[PDB]
Amino acid sequence: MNHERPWVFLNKVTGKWGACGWQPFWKATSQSLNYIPDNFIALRTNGSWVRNLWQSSKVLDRGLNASGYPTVGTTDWVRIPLDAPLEA
Amino acid sequence: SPLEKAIAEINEEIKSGTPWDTLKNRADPKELHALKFAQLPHPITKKVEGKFKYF
Amino acid sequence: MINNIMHMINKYTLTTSHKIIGILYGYMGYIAGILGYIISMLIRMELNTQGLAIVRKVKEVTIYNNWITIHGLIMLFVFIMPVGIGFYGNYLIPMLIGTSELSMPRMNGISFWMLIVGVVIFVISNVLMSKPISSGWTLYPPLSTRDADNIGVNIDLSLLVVHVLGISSTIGSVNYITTNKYNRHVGLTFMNINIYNFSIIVTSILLIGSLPILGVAITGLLLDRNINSTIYDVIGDPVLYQHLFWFFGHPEVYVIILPVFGLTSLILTSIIHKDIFGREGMMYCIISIGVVGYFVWAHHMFTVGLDIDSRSYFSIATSIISIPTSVKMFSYINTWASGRGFRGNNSSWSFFSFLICFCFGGFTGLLLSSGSLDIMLHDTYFVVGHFHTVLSLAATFGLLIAHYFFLPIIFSYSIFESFSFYHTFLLLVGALLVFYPMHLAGLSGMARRVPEYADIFIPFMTVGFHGTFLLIFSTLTFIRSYFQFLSHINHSNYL
Amino acid sequence: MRYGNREIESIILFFDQTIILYTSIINALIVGIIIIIRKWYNRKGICNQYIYHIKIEVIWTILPIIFLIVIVLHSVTVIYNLEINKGTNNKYINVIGNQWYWIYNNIESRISSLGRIILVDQPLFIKANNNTHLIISSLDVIHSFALPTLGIKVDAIPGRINNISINGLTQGLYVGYCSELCGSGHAFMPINLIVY
Amino acid sequence: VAKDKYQLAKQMAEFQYKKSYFEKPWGYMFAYYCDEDRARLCGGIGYVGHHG
Amino acid sequence: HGSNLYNRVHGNLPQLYVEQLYNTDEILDTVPHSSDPVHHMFPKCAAASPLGFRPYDNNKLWDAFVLWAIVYGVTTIFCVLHILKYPQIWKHLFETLTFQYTYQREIGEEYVWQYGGGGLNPAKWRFVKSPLEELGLVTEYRSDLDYPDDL
Ligand code: HEA
Ligand code: HEA
Ligand SMILES: CCCCCCCCCCCCCCCCCC(=O)OC[C@H](COP(=O)([O-])OCC[N+](C)(C)C)OC(=O)CCCCCCCCCCCCCCCCC
Ligand SMILES: [Cu+2]
Ligand SMILES: [Cu+2]
Numbered sequence A: 001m002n003h004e005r006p007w008v009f010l011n012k013v014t015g016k017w018g019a020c021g022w023q024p025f026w027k028a029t030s031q032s033l034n035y036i037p038d039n040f041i042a043l044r045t046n047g048s049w050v051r052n053l054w055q056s057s058k059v060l061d062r063g064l065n066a067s068g069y070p071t072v073g074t075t076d077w078v079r080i081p082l083d084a085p086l087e088a
Numbered sequence B: 001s002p003l004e005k006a007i008a009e010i011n012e013e014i015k016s017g018t019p020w021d022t023l024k025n026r027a028d029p030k031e032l033h034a035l036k037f038a039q040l041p042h043p044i045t046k047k048v049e050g051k052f053k054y055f
Numbered sequence C: 001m002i003n004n005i006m007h008m009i010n011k012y013t014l015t016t017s018h019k020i021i022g023i024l025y026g027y028m029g030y031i032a033g034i035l036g037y038i039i040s041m042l043i044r045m046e047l048n049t050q051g052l053a054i055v056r057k058v059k060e061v062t063i064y065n066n067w068i069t070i071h072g073l074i075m076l077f078v079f080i081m082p083v084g085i086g087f088y089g090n091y092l093i094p095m096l097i098g099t100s101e102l103s104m105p106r107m108n109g110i111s112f113w114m115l116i117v118g119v120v121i122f123v124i125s126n127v128l129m130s131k132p133i134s135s136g137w138t139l140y141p142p143l144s145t146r147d148a149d150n151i152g153v154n155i156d157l158s159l160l161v162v163h164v165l166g167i168s169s170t171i172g173s174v175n176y177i178t179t180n181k182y183n184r185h186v187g188l189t190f191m192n193i194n195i196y197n198f199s200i201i202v203t204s205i206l207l208i209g210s211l212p213i214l215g216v217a218i219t220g221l222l223l224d225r226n227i228n229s230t231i232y233d234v235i236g237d238p239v240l241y242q243h244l245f246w247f248f249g250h251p252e253v254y255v256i257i258l259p260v261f262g263l264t265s266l267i268l269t270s271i272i273h274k275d276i277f278g279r280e281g282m283m284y285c286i287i288s289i290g291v292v293g294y295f296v297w298a299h300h301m302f303t304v305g306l307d308i309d310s311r312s313y314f315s316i317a318t319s320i321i322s323i324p325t326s327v328k329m330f331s332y333i334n335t336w337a338s339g340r341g342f343r344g345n346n347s348s349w350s351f352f353s354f355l356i357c358f359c360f361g362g363f364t365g366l367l368l369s370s371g372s373l374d375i376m377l378h379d380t381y382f383v384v385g386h387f388h389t390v391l392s393l394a395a396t397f398g399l400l401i402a403h404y405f406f407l408p409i410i411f412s413y414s415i416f417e418s419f420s421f422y423h424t425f426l427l428l429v430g431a432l433l434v435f436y437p438m439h440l441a442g443l444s445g446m447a448r449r450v451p452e453y454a455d456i457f458i459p460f461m462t463v464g465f466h467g468t469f470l471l472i473f474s475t476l477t478f479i480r481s482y483f484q485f486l487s488h489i490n491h492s493n494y495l
Numbered sequence D: 001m002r003y004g005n006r007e008i009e010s011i012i013l014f015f016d017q018t019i020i021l022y023t024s025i026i027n028a029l030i031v032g033i034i035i036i037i038r039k040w041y042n043r044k045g046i047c048n049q050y051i052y053h054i055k056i057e058v059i060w061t062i063l064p065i066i067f068l069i070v071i072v073l074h075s076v077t078v079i080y081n082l083e084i085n086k087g088t089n090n091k092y093i094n095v096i097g098n099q100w101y102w103i104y105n106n107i108e109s110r111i112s113s114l115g116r117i118i119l120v121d122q123p124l125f126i127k128a129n130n131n132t133h134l135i136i137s138s139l140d141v142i143h144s145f146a147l148p149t150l151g152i153k154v155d156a157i158p159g160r161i162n163n164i165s166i167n168g169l170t171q172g173l174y175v176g177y178c179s180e181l182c183g184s185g186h187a188f189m190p191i192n193l194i195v196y
Numbered sequence E: 001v002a003k004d005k006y007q008l009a010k011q012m013a014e015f016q017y018k019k020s021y022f023e024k025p026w027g028y029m030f031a032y033y034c035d036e037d038r039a040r041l042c043g044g045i046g047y048v049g050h051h052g
Numbered sequence F: 001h002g003s004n005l006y007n008r009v010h011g012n013l014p015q016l017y018v019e020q021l022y023n024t025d026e027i028l029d030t031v032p033h034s035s036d037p038v039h040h041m042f043p044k045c046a047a048a049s050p051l052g053f054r055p056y057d058n059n060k061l062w063d064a065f066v067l068w069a070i071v072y073g074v075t076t077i078f079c080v081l082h083i084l085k086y087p088q089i090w091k092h093l094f095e096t097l098t099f100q101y102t103y104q105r106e107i108g109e110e111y112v113w114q115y116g117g118g119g120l121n122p123a124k125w126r127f128v129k130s131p132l133e134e135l136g137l138v139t140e141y142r143s144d145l146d147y148p149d150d151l
């Protein structure tokens, strides 16, 4: 499995943000004792996106001029990646 | 001790609050998930799905 | 891949590792349990419907008699003992006393493969061959020797199956005693070994003392059939055969039951996070039950014509044996108290079912101990209710406790608790509907080993019909759960 | 409603006494288990130290014993009460269990078509209030003469002549069975006794 | 074991320092270890939350 | 797992491993070595669990067949042998379970029905008519089937 790393939606006119990502899921059954699940939302990562989201929350809620970010289709939402902490 | 200093600093910090308590502008997760499915290509079918489908 | 195939075959045939022999015993036991269950379903379908709906002819009731006899033999000698004693006995006994192997590593493999030889002979004799043995699981002469429906060789093959199973059990018993007596690690005394080892030791002592007598009885049957002697003929002593067989018969019963007590005690220590209440008391009660079981054999022959003094004596001895089991039941009830057993565990609920069903079966069987009252209950459905609400609800549920406790440990995958809940609860409810009515159909006079019954007994068989459908559902659930246990996911998408 | 004999009455009364005892014990344990389970499931009353109590263990071992000697004595007396009426008879009857039919004084009795499984063409007749001796055996294999409503169930074993004492008080027909596997037609080998 | 009062005062001072610098860290580390084990045996792998 | 032969040869008493170049398997009949790999009970499960995988995958035909044989193998072998040797028993069972066989049932009759409460007690029983023929699915009962005469 290899999907996109978690991102942050941000709506401009409304000025409202929120994290998002792809959640894998499967039919429930017995587990495995010798296995702690790896990072599945952010594959092949040390799970820093949580820290980046926590750090960037103050930046985003305070009001960010994200005109330099791509949009999502024809809506008012733009995607901010959580690869590195957001300062702007 | 450094442990005592850190504990006291954290205790004072949480009085101010945490993002889950202080953040005002924040969308519900259902709206975000619906937007994800309605606009972005599925990572399996490589196309845009209307909504959530089991198969 | 020739080398790989031969290596696997050598791994599972030349082995002497107690773990591998234990898993093999467990596999064979589960398979034979399923076969016995299928035959039981055939029997039940014969009983539920009216008018010999399956055999269609009075002359062909020999098929039904063959079904009951093979059901009994399969479920007693190849289901419980291989599982209760063979599987956990081999897998755990060396580990619980801190040692590598059992004493006599080769005799362990010899035991398992003797069991397999017996199963093979039995399966070939009673399926591929015509007109098989149809004399009930207690092969009473002259029915099993001087009859018309029992003339083929496959009957003698079934008797030899009994012989091989006896040999296997004797070897296993000697091995268990020897390993537990000398290989204990330093600092562990004989009476400080955990409860399961002690119960296995006493079970082994039981098997050693009685199996030679069963061998003598079976050799008597074979000699009567083949060389045409008269040990058990109109000028012989069929009662002598009954005495010998039943001298083996009851020790076999306590051999079956005690290891279940040991396993339940061990698992309880593991899941309630507390020690056994009166561990020394339980161990002494186990040995008491073992010893007292050698003096009660003739409570299965109260109508044969025994002397009046002997009837009274055997009723007394049966009550004596009844006492210490009550002590053990109270000890269990107090053990569970004050503990922190898991509130959502199939092991916990199976323990509850085991306790309740064993108490009820013990009471019903204590009614049958009285010689006088055994006049009205011998060879009715009361006896069937008794030994099925003990065997199929106390021994089976103890093995379910062990199964749901040791699957994660052996395989390293947790258990699907909701699935197991459905299985265990439907097994409980279905089985109760099948056997509980039998009790009140025994007090009403219905004899046993009859494919056709009088019209007075319809309600009991209707409730049995209900129970049989629930049993089919439960066993399918169980098998499908196990198949799901070792199978990876089948659905996965993005949410 | 009559009893049909005195031995059956004695057995019934012993059965009722044991039933009362076992029901009392079951009720006591049910109350105890209800308290224990109700405390447990709510995560109350935990004590890992409570794994021994000498007094309680000794008492709970003693109690079943005293309540069991009474049952044993009652059962023994019931047995001997069954067996006393021997020797006070004036009629003898001999019974042979053939392969799927019975023989009384050299008269054969087989199942009939008027009744499904219960009725027989030739019953066995005994007189009311008259003590009789049944000498029972079998020719081919083991059967079991079973009339449990009169308190009679004795195996007919080849080469072994059993001897039971039968007595009737209520006039009518008692239906019984073979109560021992004997072959294909084991389920169709009924017994009919007429007390007149 | 402190015998005279001076040794008692010395032992008390040492114990206060050790409590500030060695014992409370041990307590917090052990508490974190217990909670980490509880989290490890959670999520459907073990019997966490069934009792206790 | 992988053989330990290099260590065994460079070990401390290599003369004990000369037999290992004869017709001899390493795991079963060779002297164990201080540095041997640890062998587990169910190697498939042991290698699959730490990776989060159940040992058998249903998508692979070989694995599906192997697991079927492990769980349902002897059961179906016994069933097939029984059906081959007793074709008439299963034929009769199929007839009865499909309502094709009726012992002596008539048309339009009522039959006793009681669930429990001990033996037949006239104060508790009901009488039932066949819903199949009430609807109309049944008009006559087949007679070509085997009939237990003399019962
Ligand atoms: C341990 C022994 C054992 C077990 C398990 C059973 C299980 C069952 N038995 Fe039977 N039975 C006997 C021992 C046993 N029996 C004996 C000795 C006789 C006398 C033979 C004779 O009279 O000569 C007898 C006779 C007997 C009769 C006699 C009919 C007649 O005499 O008139 C009937 C019919 O109702 C019957 C029914 C059943 C049913 C419906 C089940 C089961 O369907 C109910 C419980 C089912 C279970 C589900 C158990 C199956 C096990 C597996 C599922 C393995 C899975 C793994 C584990 C859980 C460990 N049994
Ligand atoms: C499977 C295990 C098992 C166990 C544990 C037992 C336990 C007992 N059994 Fe039985 N039995 C069988 C398996 C078992 N049995 C089988 C398979 C048959 C049929 C063989 C066949 O015919 O084919 C059989 C048949 C059988 C008969 C045959 C009746 C007849 O055929 O004529 C009799 C009668 O004496 C009997 C008696 C007992 C007694 C008195 C106990 C006692 O051990 C029970 C003791 C239990 C307790 C007493 C519970 C504890 C009670 C309390 C909590 C306190 C109450 C105590 C007092 C008031 C004293 N059993
Ligand atoms: C207040 C309501 C009482 C309970 C309602 C159900 C029972 C109706 C009245 C009982 C007395 C008359 C007997 C007739 C019916 C008995 C049914 C029965 O189980 O008999 C067995 C047994 C047969 O024993 P019995 O009925 O002979 O009891 C002895 C009766 N005397 C006093 C006359 C000797 O019945 C009982 O034990 C009676 C109580 C039954 C209550 C069952 C509750 C638990 C349900 C478990 C699942 C059962 C599934 C059934 C589903 C049916 C509908 C979908
Ligand atoms: Cu017994
Ligand atoms: Cu008969």
Ligand SMILES: [Cu+2]
Pocket: D143, D144, D178, D179, D180, D181, D182, D183, D185, D186, D187, D189
């Ligand atoms: Cu008969």
Ligand SMILES: [Mg+2]
Pocket: C378, C379, D144, D179, D180
């Ligand atoms: Mg009998």
